[PDB]
Amino acid sequence: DILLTQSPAILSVSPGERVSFSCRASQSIGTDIHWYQQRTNGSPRLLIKYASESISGIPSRFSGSGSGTDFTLSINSVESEDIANYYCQQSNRWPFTFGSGTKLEI
Amino acid sequence: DILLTQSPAILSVSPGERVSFSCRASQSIGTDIHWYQQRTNGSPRLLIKYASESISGIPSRFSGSGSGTDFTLSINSVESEDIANYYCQQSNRWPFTFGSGTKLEI
Amino acid sequence: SALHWRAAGAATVLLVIVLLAGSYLAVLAERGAPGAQLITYPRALWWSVETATTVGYGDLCPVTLWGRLVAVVVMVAGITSFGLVTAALATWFVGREQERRGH
Amino acid sequence: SALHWRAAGAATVLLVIVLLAGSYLAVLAERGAPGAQLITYPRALWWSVETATTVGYGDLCPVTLWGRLVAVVVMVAGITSFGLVTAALATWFVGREQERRGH
Amino acid sequence: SALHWRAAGAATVLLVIVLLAGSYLAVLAERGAPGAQLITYPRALWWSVETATTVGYGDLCPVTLWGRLVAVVVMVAGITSFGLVTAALATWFVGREQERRGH
Amino acid sequence: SALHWRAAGAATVLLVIVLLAGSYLAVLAERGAPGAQLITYPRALWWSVETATTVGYGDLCPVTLWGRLVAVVVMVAGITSFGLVTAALATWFVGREQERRGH
Ligand SMILES: [K+]
Ligand SMILES: [K+]
Ligand SMILES: [K+]
Ligand SMILES: [K+]
Ligand SMILES: [K+]
Ligand SMILES: [K+]
C-alpha cells in the first residue's frame, strides 16, 4: 500500500511570495498524483490532477510538477484565500491513498 | 524529475595529477549522461557524451565512465587550461536536467 | 459479397468490442487487489490493445484470476482477428493469381 | 470430416495439454533455483498461457535451463496451434470463394 | 507481375516508412511528459521496430495518449506487413503445388 | 518432393543457424558497453529464441546499435520461419480439401 509523505506539515509564507508543498511516494508512481484543497469547514476541492494538469475554475496561480516519487504543488503569489489544508492522493496502485496533509499559513 | 548530484562542489589538485569528478543520479539512467565544461565568462562546451564517448576537438586527456546511477569524468594530467566549472546532464527521462556543478581548482 | 472480406470486417468490429469490454472488466476485476495497477479505464484500454496485438510491454498486466481470464479472451480475440485478416489476404492473392493464369 | 477443422481442434486440445504439463514442469524445474519466481502452479499456468500466445509481459519468466527448454516447447506449441487455426481459416475462405465462382 | 509479390514489397517499403514516421512522431508526442523515456530518435526507432515485430521487450514504451496512438499504428502496420508476407508465401506454395499435379 | 514442406524444413534449419550466430554476435556486440547484460553465451541463446518467437520477456535485451541490428535479423528470421510453416500448413489443407471434393 503506497505511502504518501507530506513534509513539512505546516508552511509559513509572506503575502505574495512563492510557496511549495512536497509529497513523497514510497514507490515510483509515474505522475498519478492529485492535489486537493480543504478550507476550514469545507469539503476537499481538486486543484491539480496527474501532477501538473490544470483544472477549470482553479486560479492559474496554482501549478504542480514532478514524477516518480517526488511531487510538488506550487502557488505563485500566495494570498489569504489560499489558507487551508493541502492533500496529495495517488491513483497508481490499489487502494488509492492520501497524504497526511500540509497546512498553509500566512 | 531526475536529480543529478555533483559532490564535492570544489576539487583541488596539483599540476599533472589525475582528477575525478563524480555525478550521481537519483535513479538508474543507463549511460545517458553528458559532461560540459564552462570556463569563466565562457559558454558550456561538450566534453563527453553518453558517459564515455569522445568528442572531436577535445584533448584525449579527458575521459568518462560509469553507468546506472554513478558517473565519473576524469582528467589525466590536469593543467591550467582545465580550470573551470564542470556539469553533467542527463537525457534518459524528460525533462533533461543538469547537475549543480563542480569547480576545478589547481 | 466475398465472405473473407466480410469476416475480416466482422472480426475488426468484434475486436473493438472485446477491447472496450476487456478494458471495463479488467478494471472491475483488478480493483480490490492490493498492488494492482490495471485500475483506471484509459490505461486499461491501452493495456487491452497492447495484449490483443500481443506486444505486451509489461508496463501493465493483470494480477487477479478474473483479470487474467479477461486477458486470455483479449489475447485470443486479437490473435484470431489478425489471423483472420491474413487468411483473407491469402484468399485474395490465391484468387487473383488464378485469374493471372486464366481460370 | 474436413481435415483443416479437425486439425484445428486437435491443435486446441493439444495446446491445452501442453499448457498444463508446461505449468507442472516449469514449477518442477524452477524450484531449487535461488531467485526463481515461477514456483507455484496457479501463476505458472498464467505464465504458460502468456508464453503460448507470445504476449510475454515479463511478470514471470524462467531462469533455469530446463525451465527455458519447457518455455520453448510452450512457445512453439502455441505458435503452431494458432498458426494452424489461421491456415484452416484460409482453407475455408479459399474453398467458399471457389463456390462463389461456381467450382 | 505477380500481385502477391508486389503487395509484399509495397508492404515492406510502407512498413519502413511507418517505422521512421513513428519514431519521429513518438518523440514529438512523448517530450513534454514527465518521466517519458521515448524521447531521442535513435532509441525511438529501435522501439518502433520492437513494436512492429510485436516483440515488446519493455525497455521503452509510450506513456502519452498520442504516443500510444502512434504505437497502435506501428503494431498494426507491422502485423499487417508480416501477415501479408505469409499470405504471399501461401499463394506461392499453393500455385506451385498445383503445378506439381499438372494444373 | 513437396516444396512447401521442403521450404519449411530449410526454414527450421536456417532459423537454428540464425539463433546460434545471433547468440554469438549479440555477445560480441554487447561486451564493451557499460550496463549491458547480453554478455554470456548461454543466456544470449535463450534471448535469441525469446526474440525469434517474439515473446520478448524483457529479462534480456540489447542496448548497443549492432546488438539491436542483430536483434532485428533474429526477429525477422523467426517471424518469417514460423510464417512459412503456417503457409505450408495452408497448402496442405487446401490441397487435401480439393481431394475431398474429387479434384
Ligand atoms: K508477439
Ligand atoms: K511479445
Ligand atoms: K513482451
Ligand atoms: K516485456
Ligand atoms: K519488463
Ligand atoms: K503471428
Cell digits of residue C77: 480475440
Distance CA B97, CA C7 (A): 52
The answer to whether the beta carbons of residues A6 and A87 sit under 8 Å apart is: yes
Are F56 and E57 in contact (CB < 8 Å)?
yes
Q: What is the dihedral of CA D83, D88, D94, D96, to 10 degrees?
A: -150
Mutate to test the interface with E, among C89, C98, C103 (most CBs of E within 10 A): C89
Nearest CA in chain C to F51: C55
Q: Does F95 touch chain D (CB under 8 A)?
A: no
Q: Which amino acid is located at C94 in the chain?
A: V
Distance CA A58, CA A34 (A): 14
Distance CA E2, CA E13 (A): 17
Distance CA D23, CA D77 (A): 14
Interface contacts D/F by beta carbons within 8 Å: 68
Are F58 and C54 in contact (CB < 8 Å)?
no
Distance from CA of E38 to the nearest CA of B (A): 8
Residue A94 neighbours by CB under 8 Å, 6+ apart: C30, C31, C32, C33, C34, C35, C36, C37, C39
Question: Which residues of chain E neighbour C56 with C-beta distances below 8 Å?
Answer: 56, 58
The answer to whether the beta carbons of residues D78 and D52 sit under 8 Å apart is: yes
- In three state form, how does the secondary structure of chain E look? CCHHHHHHHHHHHHHHHHHHHHHHHHHHHHCCCCCCCCCCHHHHHHHHHHHHCCCCCCCCCCCCHHHHHHHHHHHHHHHHHHHHHHHHHHHHHHHHHHHCCCC
Cell digits of residue D91: 482453407
Exposure string of C42-68, with b = 16+ CB inside 10 Å and e = fewer, is ebbbbbbbbbbbbbbbbbbbbbbeebb
Q: Does E93 touch chain F (CB under 8 A)?
A: yes
Distance CA E2, CA B69 (A): 55
Exposure string of F46-81, with b = 16+ CB inside 10 Å and e = fewer, is bbbbbbbbbbbbbbbbbbbeebbebbbbbbbbbbbb
Compute the distance from residue F96 Cα to the ligand 2 centre, in Å.
34
Nearest CA in chain E to C46: E68
Are E35 and A52 in contact (CB < 8 Å)?
no
Count Cα neighbours of C63 within 13 Å in the Cβ-side half-sphere.
Answer: 15
The answer to whether the beta carbons of residues F31 and F39 sit under 8 Å apart is: yes
Residue F63 neighbours by CB under 8 Å, 6+ apart: B30, E59, F30, F33, F35, F36, F38
Cell digits of residue C21: 469490454
The answer to whether the beta carbons of residues A69 and A25 sit under 8 Å apart is: yes
B76 three-state secondary structure: strand
Residue E36, judged by CB atoms within 10 A of its CB (0-12, 13-18, 19+), counts as buried
Cell digits of residue C55: 506486444
Q: Which of E86, E87, E60 is nearest to E74 (CA)?
A: E60
A45 three-state secondary structure: strand
A12 DSSP β-pair partners: A105
Q: Of all helices (H) and strands (E), which one includes residue D15?
A: helix D3-30
Are C3 and D58 in contact (CB < 8 Å)?
no
A98 DSSP β-pair partners: A89
**Partner chains of D (3+ C-beta pairs under 8 Å):** C, E, F
Q: Which of D1, D70, D61, D60 is nearest to D29 (CA)?
A: D70
Q: Which of D15, B33, D90 is nearest to F91 (CA)?
A: D90
Give the method of determination: X-ray
Are D90 and C87 in contact (CB < 8 Å)?
yes
Count Cα neighbours of C70 within 13 Å in the Cβ-side half-sphere.
Answer: 26
Distance CA D78, CA D53 (A): 6
The answer to whether the beta carbons of residues B28 and B69 sit under 8 Å apart is: yes
Q: Which of E43, E40, E70 is nearest to E57 (CA)?
A: E43
Distance from CA of C12 to the nearest CA of F (A): 22
The answer to whether the beta carbons of residues B16 and B79 sit under 8 Å apart is: yes
Q: Which amino acid is located at A66 in the chain?
A: G
Compute the distance from residue E49 Cα to the ligand 4 centre, in Å.
15
Nearest CA in chain B to E29: B94
Distance from CA of A94 to the nearest CA of B (A): 24
Are C85 and E83 in contact (CB < 8 Å)?
yes
Alpha helices, DSSP H, located in chain C: 3-30, 41-52, 65-99
Other beta carbons within 10 angstroms of residue D86's beta carbon come to 27
Distance CA A47, CA C36 (A): 26
Alpha helices, DSSP H, located in chain B: none
Q: Which of B1, B27, B93 sits opposite A66 (nearest CB)?
A: B1
Q: Which of E87, E57, E62 is nearest to E72 (CA)?
A: E62
Cell digits of residue A97: 491513498
What is the helix, strand, coil percentage profile of chain B, to 5? 5, 50, 50
Q: Which stretches does DSSP call E strand in chain A?
A: 4-5, 10-12, 18-25, 33-38, 45-49, 53-54, 62-67, 70-76, 85-90, 97-98, 102-105
Q: Is B47 left (phi over 0), alpha (psi -120 to 50) or beta?
A: alpha
Chain centroid to Cα D97, Å, comes to 30
Q: Which amino acid is located at A75 in the chain?
A: I
Are F35 and B52 in contact (CB < 8 Å)?
no
Find the angle CA(A63)-CA(A68)-CA(A74) to the nearest 5 degrees.
Answer: 15
- DSSP assignment, residue B36? E
In order of their start, the domains of chain D are: 1-103 (1.10.287.70)
Distance CA C75, CA C69 (A): 10
Distance CA F21, CA F27 (A): 10
The answer to whether the beta carbons of residues C41 and C76 sit under 8 Å apart is: no
Cell digits of residue C39: 485500475
Kindly indicate whether the domain formed by A1-106 is annotated with CATH number 2.60.40.10: yes
The answer to whether the beta carbons of residues D91 and D97 sit under 8 Å apart is: no
Distance CA F91, CA C2 (A): 21
The ligand whose atoms approach the alpha carbon of F53 most closely is 1
The answer to whether the beta carbons of residues E26 and A23 sit under 8 Å apart is: no
Are E35 and B95 in contact (CB < 8 Å)?
no
Residue C69 neighbours by CB under 8 Å, 6+ apart: none
Other beta carbons within 10 angstroms of residue A103's beta carbon come to 15
Other beta carbons within 10 angstroms of residue C9's beta carbon come to 12
Residue E99, judged by CB atoms within 10 A of its CB (0-12, 13-18, 19+), counts as exposed
Distance CA B100, CA B98 (A): 7
| φ, ψ dihedrals at A33, nearest 5° | -130, 135
In angstroms, the Cα distances linking C69 to A8, C26, C53, D42 are: 45, 9, 17, 12
C 10-49 residues with CB < 8 A to D: none
A85 DSSP β-pair partners: A38, A103
Cell digits of residue A95: 487502494
Resolution limit, Å? 2.4
Residue entry with cell 493471372: C100
Give all strands of the β-sheet with B4-5 in edge-to-edge order: B4-5, B18-25, B70-76, B62-67
Domain ranges in chain A?
A: 1-106
The answer to whether the beta carbons of residues E98 and C97 sit under 8 Å apart is: no
How are beta strands A102-105 and A10-12 bridged, if at all?
parallel
The answer to whether the beta carbons of residues A16 and A79 sit under 8 Å apart is: yes
Q: Which of C25, C27, C49, C45 is nearest to C36 (CA)?
A: C27
